[PDB]
mmCIF file of N, CA, C and O in Angstrom:
data_model
loop_
_atom_site.group_PDB
_atom_site.id
_atom_site.type_symbol
_atom_site.label_atom_id
_atom_site.label_comp_id
_atom_site.label_asym_id
_atom_site.label_seq_id
_atom_site.Cartn_x
_atom_site.Cartn_y
_atom_site.Cartn_z
ATOM 1 N N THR A 1 101.865 129.147 78.144
ATOM 2 C CA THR A 1 102.106 129.479 76.744
ATOM 3 C C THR A 1 102.597 130.917 76.612
ATOM 4 O O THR A 1 103.772 131.205 76.843
ATOM 5 N N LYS A 2 101.691 131.815 76.239
ATOM 6 C CA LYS A 2 102.044 133.221 76.079
ATOM 7 C C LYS A 2 102.713 133.753 77.342
ATOM 8 O O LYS A 2 103.228 134.871 77.359
ATOM 9 N N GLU A 3 102.704 132.945 78.396
ATOM 10 C CA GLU A 3 103.313 133.345 79.659
ATOM 11 C C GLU A 3 104.824 133.486 79.504
ATOM 12 O O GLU A 3 105.439 134.369 80.102
ATOM 13 N N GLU A 4 105.416 132.609 78.699
ATOM 14 C CA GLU A 4 106.856 132.646 78.475
ATOM 15 C C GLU A 4 107.257 133.936 77.765
ATOM 16 O O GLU A 4 108.291 134.530 78.075
ATOM 17 N N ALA A 5 106.435 134.362 76.813
ATOM 18 C CA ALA A 5 106.715 135.583 76.065
ATOM 19 C C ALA A 5 106.689 136.795 76.990
ATOM 20 O O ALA A 5 107.502 137.710 76.853
ATOM 21 N N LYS A 6 105.754 136.794 77.934
ATOM 22 C CA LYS A 6 105.634 137.898 78.880
ATOM 23 C C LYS A 6 106.884 137.996 79.749
ATOM 24 O O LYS A 6 107.371 139.090 80.033
ATOM 25 N N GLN A 7 107.397 136.844 80.170
ATOM 26 C CA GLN A 7 108.589 136.811 81.010
ATOM 27 C C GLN A 7 109.785 137.399 80.267
ATOM 28 O O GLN A 7 110.611 138.096 80.856
ATOM 29 N N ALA A 8 109.872 137.110 78.974
ATOM 30 C CA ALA A 8 110.975 137.614 78.163
ATOM 31 C C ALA A 8 110.978 139.139 78.150
ATOM 32 O O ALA A 8 112.034 139.766 78.215
ATOM 33 N N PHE A 9 109.789 139.728 78.073
ATOM 34 C CA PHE A 9 109.669 141.182 78.057
ATOM 35 C C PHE A 9 110.226 141.780 79.345
ATOM 36 O O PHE A 9 110.988 142.747 79.314
ATOM 37 N N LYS A 10 109.838 141.201 80.477
ATOM 38 C CA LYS A 10 110.305 141.686 81.770
ATOM 39 C C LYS A 10 111.816 141.519 81.895
ATOM 40 O O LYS A 10 112.511 142.412 82.376
ATOM 41 N N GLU A 11 112.317 140.369 81.457
ATOM 42 C CA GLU A 11 113.746 140.095 81.523
ATOM 43 C C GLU A 11 114.513 141.022 80.589
ATOM 44 O O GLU A 11 115.621 141.459 80.903
ATOM 45 N N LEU A 12 113.920 141.316 79.438
ATOM 46 C CA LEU A 12 114.562 142.188 78.467
ATOM 47 C C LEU A 12 114.773 143.581 79.056
ATOM 48 O O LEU A 12 115.833 144.183 78.885
ATOM 49 N N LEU A 13 113.755 144.087 79.742
ATOM 50 C CA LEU A 13 113.841 145.412 80.345
ATOM 51 C C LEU A 13 114.929 145.442 81.412
ATOM 52 O O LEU A 13 115.694 146.400 81.501
ATOM 53 N N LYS A 14 114.992 144.388 82.215
ATOM 54 C CA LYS A 14 115.993 144.303 83.273
ATOM 55 C C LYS A 14 117.397 144.250 82.679
ATOM 56 O O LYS A 14 118.325 144.871 83.200
ATOM 57 N N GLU A 15 117.547 143.498 81.595
ATOM 58 C CA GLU A 15 118.844 143.364 80.944
ATOM 59 C C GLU A 15 119.308 144.707 80.391
ATOM 60 O O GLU A 15 120.493 145.037 80.453
ATOM 61 N N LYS A 16 118.370 145.474 79.850
ATOM 62 C CA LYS A 16 118.696 146.778 79.287
ATOM 63 C C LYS A 16 118.462 147.881 80.314
ATOM 64 O O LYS A 16 117.571 147.781 81.156
ATOM 65 N N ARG A 17 119.270 148.934 80.241
ATOM 66 C CA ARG A 17 119.142 150.049 81.172
ATOM 67 C C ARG A 17 117.950 150.923 80.799
ATOM 68 O O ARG A 17 117.644 151.101 79.619
ATOM 69 N N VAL A 18 117.282 151.468 81.810
ATOM 70 C CA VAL A 18 116.124 152.324 81.577
ATOM 71 C C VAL A 18 116.186 153.556 82.475
ATOM 72 O O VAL A 18 115.423 153.679 83.433
ATOM 73 N N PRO A 19 117.077 154.463 82.179
ATOM 74 C CA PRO A 19 117.248 155.713 82.974
ATOM 75 C C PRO A 19 115.920 156.417 83.236
ATOM 76 O O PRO A 19 115.051 156.471 82.368
ATOM 77 N N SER A 20 115.770 156.942 84.449
ATOM 78 C CA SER A 20 114.542 157.630 84.827
ATOM 79 C C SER A 20 114.319 158.849 83.939
ATOM 80 O O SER A 20 113.181 159.221 83.654
ATOM 81 N N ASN A 21 115.413 159.468 83.509
ATOM 82 C CA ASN A 21 115.327 160.648 82.656
ATOM 83 C C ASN A 21 114.632 160.307 81.342
ATOM 84 O O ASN A 21 113.828 161.088 80.833
ATOM 85 N N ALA A 22 114.948 159.136 80.797
ATOM 86 C CA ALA A 22 114.346 158.701 79.541
ATOM 87 C C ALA A 22 112.824 158.653 79.663
ATOM 88 O O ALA A 22 112.232 159.402 80.439
ATOM 89 N N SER A 23 112.193 157.764 78.898
ATOM 90 C CA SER A 23 110.748 157.629 78.933
ATOM 91 C C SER A 23 110.331 156.255 78.412
ATOM 92 O O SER A 23 111.093 155.581 77.724
ATOM 93 N N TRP A 24 109.116 155.856 78.744
ATOM 94 C CA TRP A 24 108.594 154.562 78.308
ATOM 95 C C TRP A 24 108.625 154.461 76.787
ATOM 96 O O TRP A 24 108.974 153.420 76.232
ATOM 97 N N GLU A 25 108.262 155.551 76.119
ATOM 98 C CA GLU A 25 108.253 155.571 74.660
ATOM 99 C C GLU A 25 109.648 155.287 74.113
ATOM 100 O O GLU A 25 109.811 154.494 73.187
ATOM 101 N N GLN A 26 110.651 155.934 74.696
ATOM 102 C CA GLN A 26 112.029 155.737 74.263
ATOM 103 C C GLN A 26 112.496 154.320 74.584
ATOM 104 O O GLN A 26 113.181 153.686 73.785
ATOM 105 N N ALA A 27 112.119 153.832 75.763
ATOM 106 C CA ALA A 27 112.508 152.490 76.183
ATOM 107 C C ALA A 27 111.926 151.443 75.238
ATOM 108 O O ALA A 27 112.576 150.449 74.919
ATOM 109 N N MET A 28 110.698 151.675 74.792
ATOM 110 C CA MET A 28 110.040 150.748 73.877
ATOM 111 C C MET A 28 110.772 150.705 72.540
ATOM 112 O O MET A 28 110.919 149.656 71.936
ATOM 113 N N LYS A 29 111.223 151.860 72.081
ATOM 114 C CA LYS A 29 111.938 151.945 70.815
ATOM 115 C C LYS A 29 113.283 151.231 70.901
ATOM 116 O O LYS A 29 113.787 150.710 69.905
ATOM 117 N N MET A 30 113.875 151.243 72.090
ATOM 118 C CA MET A 30 115.177 150.616 72.285
ATOM 119 C C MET A 30 115.112 149.116 72.021
ATOM 120 O O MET A 30 115.982 148.561 71.351
ATOM 121 N N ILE A 31 114.076 148.473 72.546
ATOM 122 C CA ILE A 31 113.906 147.037 72.358
ATOM 123 C C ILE A 31 113.472 146.719 70.931
ATOM 124 O O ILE A 31 113.793 145.656 70.402
ATOM 125 N N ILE A 32 112.750 147.649 70.318
ATOM 126 C CA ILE A 32 112.284 147.466 68.951
ATOM 127 C C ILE A 32 113.459 147.392 67.984
ATOM 128 O O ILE A 32 113.472 146.565 67.074
ATOM 129 N N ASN A 33 114.439 148.264 68.186
ATOM 130 C CA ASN A 33 115.610 148.293 67.320
ATOM 131 C C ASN A 33 116.346 146.961 67.379
ATOM 132 O O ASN A 33 116.816 146.456 66.358
ATOM 133 N N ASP A 34 116.443 146.400 68.583
ATOM 134 C CA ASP A 34 117.120 145.138 68.770
ATOM 135 C C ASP A 34 116.620 144.096 67.755
ATOM 136 O O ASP A 34 115.411 143.867 67.647
ATOM 137 N N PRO A 35 117.509 143.461 67.030
ATOM 138 C CA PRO A 35 117.140 142.426 66.028
ATOM 139 C C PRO A 35 116.147 141.409 66.587
ATOM 140 O O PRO A 35 115.327 140.862 65.851
ATOM 141 N N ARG A 36 116.223 141.167 67.890
ATOM 142 C CA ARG A 36 115.324 140.218 68.536
ATOM 143 C C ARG A 36 113.869 140.626 68.322
ATOM 144 O O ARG A 36 112.978 139.777 68.279
ATOM 145 N N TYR A 37 113.637 141.926 68.192
ATOM 146 C CA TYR A 37 112.285 142.434 67.985
ATOM 147 C C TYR A 37 111.674 141.830 66.723
ATOM 148 O O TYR A 37 110.523 141.397 66.728
ATOM 149 N N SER A 38 112.453 141.806 65.647
ATOM 150 C CA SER A 38 111.974 141.252 64.385
ATOM 151 C C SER A 38 111.591 139.785 64.555
ATOM 152 O O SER A 38 110.573 139.335 64.031
ATOM 153 N N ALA A 39 112.409 139.045 65.297
ATOM 154 C CA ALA A 39 112.142 137.631 65.534
ATOM 155 C C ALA A 39 110.869 137.457 66.357
ATOM 156 O O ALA A 39 110.094 136.529 66.131
ATOM 157 N N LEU A 40 110.660 138.356 67.314
ATOM 158 C CA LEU A 40 109.478 138.291 68.165
ATOM 159 C C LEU A 40 108.210 138.462 67.337
ATOM 160 O O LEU A 40 107.219 137.764 67.551
ATOM 161 N N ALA A 41 108.247 139.396 66.392
ATOM 162 C CA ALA A 41 107.092 139.648 65.539
ATOM 163 C C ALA A 41 106.785 138.429 64.674
ATOM 164 O O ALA A 41 105.625 138.055 64.502
ATOM 165 N N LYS A 42 107.833 137.813 64.138
ATOM 166 C CA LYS A 42 107.664 136.634 63.295
ATOM 167 C C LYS A 42 107.078 135.478 64.097
ATOM 168 O O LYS A 42 106.180 134.780 63.627
ATOM 169 N N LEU A 43 107.592 135.284 65.308
ATOM 170 C CA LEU A 43 107.114 134.208 66.168
ATOM 171 C C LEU A 43 106.855 132.944 65.355
ATOM 172 O O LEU A 43 106.067 132.087 65.753
ATOM 173 N N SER A 44 107.520 132.839 64.209
ATOM 174 C CA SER A 44 107.353 131.677 63.343
ATOM 175 C C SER A 44 108.407 131.672 62.241
ATOM 176 O O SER A 44 109.507 131.151 62.423
#
């Protein structure tokens, strides 16, 4: 179940670039901006 959602997160990070210079906080914001983020929250 929730296992599929976890996989999406890992795949999302791989799909998007995450420069070492950046930071986890910045990387998190990057995925949040993505419209997909809104859909993830709705999950319904």
